[PDB]
Design a protein around this ligand. Structure first.
Ligand SMILES: [Cl-]
Ligand SMILES: [Cl-]
Ligand SMILES: [Cl-]
Ligand SMILES: [Cl-]
Ligand code: NA
Ligand code: NA
Ligand code: NA
Ligand code: NA
Ligand code: NA
Ligand code: NA
Lengths: 267, 265, 265, 267
């Protein structure tokens, strides 16, 4: 019953989180750990960073790892993942792709791959965030009248874009729940004489500082009451957890392109 | 076409909020303002406290009010409310009852044979909707999330945790066919050890004049999801009462609660 | 020995809260309840709305009230308040003024030559104390902490950020000899780039009937420290007014604010 | 002007955070990295976990590291730290000790050491927490009447003790600010008919779940208003930051036993 899993970018912060997750999962075993060709770390035990001698040495031999693994979990770089994709296809590996920054042709390449292998690709592998979108969708219909909708988001001192993509996705989900679009009703920050708030407005506030990983709150502010739905990310560790649920979903599947909506039965 | 609404206990704190909500609702008109025989406000314009003139004078005349109104919204006392019910029964009034609570509940379910009424102890849109949000969230986070319910109330609240927090617990427990009696931990203290993943832990904060905050925390590996309801005051029940009246506009007779009102059951 | 206190605008929302606070304070006694000539409540017991009998009947008689009271607490309108001030000047009343605001401030600083009075737009213990907490925190977190001020108010609030949030910013800026005009960023949106460590960023949330929440976040590497003030209603100003009266008990004449009252400057 | 710093337990999670902090600090250089004798990791570059070849190899030679370093930062184990202490004394090293679980004789050993070397020892190296205690002290005097004081604390699913030591320290600080003691006024959790709240009570609530590192809130609940002072720890990274401020304080000191109150000028 036990998933034979390889992890890509095994020396990276994400790869290390994925390794600790695989080791801890009772229904998975770590059988491969890849790092780039020429990495100083090649030859080290995958678990050396933690307490453990896993007996799995970091290697750059993509072919052997794909031969020996049934699953590869990959949160690295688009061109790196595409190299892994070709091996995954020839070796019939089930693939969980948490990498980001693909072009449209590359994304379509991943879908095409889904005709031959089973894979999950998602921009957000978090159980929490994906469920929160569905919660927001129900809340936006139930609170469609009498509630002013505000989206408040906090991230670290280096985030260059306001509001975050997650906040924007949340806004779109909320707008669509009543057949609207965001750019009709979105207000981004407020300064000066902003006047009476229009009841249809979706107001965004973007807080920035420290090393905050990402907090997102949707506030439904009514007359005499408030309802808040908040997601707090403490670290990329939550992506490792969703990646394993993705692997468990893929265990039942022969071929197909899937996202986290499929994995979580949300769609 | 606008709902012709009367308000009971009209010079009281809750009555005033109801009057405010009826005037502000663009589909409701105030036609009656009922108060006790012993009220010092009889004869005054229902809106005077707002500096408005409504054409509606506070009266103790239960009969005239019920004859003249299509709806009566009543958040008063059981005795006065049951007197109001008999008059509603005779005049075919759609009744919205925010009173709490009495044995007595039987008589007003029995009234639903002849008139349309809504009764609920919690007439807030927010709390009722939140209950259904928890049901979905409990199923979706059934694995990997430690569930904690945190509730805050005023310095005079005698019971912990709140009945609302308990309802949240039961809803959550039930969403996976469970009972709260199997998994509840209330106000932990001392050496409690490794938290069991199935536990629902309750925390009860007491102080000041906090009207009532309720948070359900789903605490997972690397992340947390929180669903919070904050009550600022009884004004939210006045908003819910108006939705109750709107629902009742379509109904001939029957006993209903906020679930029916909001289309949730 | 208990403070002999009169309340202005006694049948209004704020007047009622003041009456409540005076009765509840174990060192204060209600001796006067003043209202407008045009009030429909004259003659009624000041406590009737509470189901209490105080021995104090609502009157428009400014002269008698000031003659009979040692203190007058007044949160009404400038015109009525300035009429109240002249009577306080003639009867040596200790005046607590929550009214806002008028040009007019000059006359009531000038009144401090002859009587003892407190004037403040923000009569809350919590907000004034929080201001001094921020001063200490800004100095201690002067290096390594990004400072963000987050404020929430109701759907009708026209200005952003709130004046309170601005005062918090200025206090923080000043704690390191700085100006807010040098470092403030209000409502960021779009590509804003690397946050400058000196920036004080303001966020303004608007919706519902939120009375006013203000949070100062100190966001550091691995940790955050938050200092938050939440106003539920004007009842907190009634509490502050009573502390103002207590402070005034010791004073012969003089113009004072909440800083003096709470011993903060 | 640049502090020559060695880090103990260089393969541990804390040691790794301390290494990244030293590397990033503009006024410090990493000159030594210690790990236990027999560690598999001996010989590796201290920065291999990050992107960087620091040229500092992990070693178990305590003598050489203390000879070459001016500062040693040590968040390891009490018996390990005591071995380091003796080297620190013979080599005149400035010591920052973040280790915990010492006995009273051992603590007194650290103080005695302070006659010969300059050192910082503290149970909490966080700037945030230490400043928060002082904030709480001022707030407790200002809010001494009319405010119900509640302490709410959240930690991970494995914390066995409720409330946390930090919460208890917060309670004691608050009680002392009006000449009281905690065990006279503390109420720990609430269940059942608890009755009218006594205005002097300090009520504690302990929330448990997930991997929450530690949130602490003091609530001053008044009539018509609330004042909250909250400290959120995201990770042990904040201890690394306070350890460096400790090193900077120690740069000016020849000998002496110091804690974070000294380091931050709070006392
Ligand atoms: Cl707006
Ligand atoms: Cl009535
Ligand atoms: Cl008046
Ligand atoms: Cl208690
Ligand atoms: Na495993
Ligand atoms: Na209306
Ligand atoms: Na359940
Ligand atoms: Na009194
Ligand atoms: Na400053
Ligand atoms: Na450095």
């Amino acid at each position: 019953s036990s998933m034979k899993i390889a992890i890509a970018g095994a020396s990276g912060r994400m790869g290390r989180m994925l390794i600790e997750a695989v080791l801890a999962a009772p229904d998975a075993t770590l059988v491969g750990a890849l790092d780039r060709t020429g990495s100083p770390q090649l030859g080290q035990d995958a678990g050396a960073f933690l307490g453990k001698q896993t007996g799995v040495a970091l290697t750059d031999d993509i072919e052997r790892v794909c031969a020996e693994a049934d699953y590869l979990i990959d949160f690295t770089l688009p061109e790196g993942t595409l190299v892994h994709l070709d091996a995954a296809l020839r070796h019939d590996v089930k693939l969980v792709i948490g990498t980001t920054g693909f072009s449209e042709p590359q994304k379509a390449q991943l879908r095409a791959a889904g005709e031959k292998i089973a894979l999950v690709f998602s921009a957000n592998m978090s159980v929490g965030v994906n469920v929160t979108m569905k919660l927001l969708e129900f809340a936006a219909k139930q609170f469609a009248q009498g509630y002013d909708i505000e989206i408040i988001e906090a991230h670290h001192r280096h985030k260059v874009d306001a509001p975050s993509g997650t906040a924007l996705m949340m806004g779109e989900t909320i707008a669509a729940a009543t057949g609207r679009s965001l750019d009709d009703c979105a207000v981004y920050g407020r300064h000066g004489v902003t006047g009476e708030r229009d009841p249809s407005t979706i107001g965004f506030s973007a807080i920035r500082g420290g090393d905050i990983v990402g907090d997102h709150t949707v506030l439904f502010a009514g007359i005499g009451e408030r309802i808040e739905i908040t997601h707090k990310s403490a670290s990329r560790v939550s992506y490792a957890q969703g990646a394993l649920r993705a692997a468990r979903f893929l265990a039942g599947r022969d071929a197909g392109f899937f996202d986290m909506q499929d994995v979580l039965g949300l769609r």
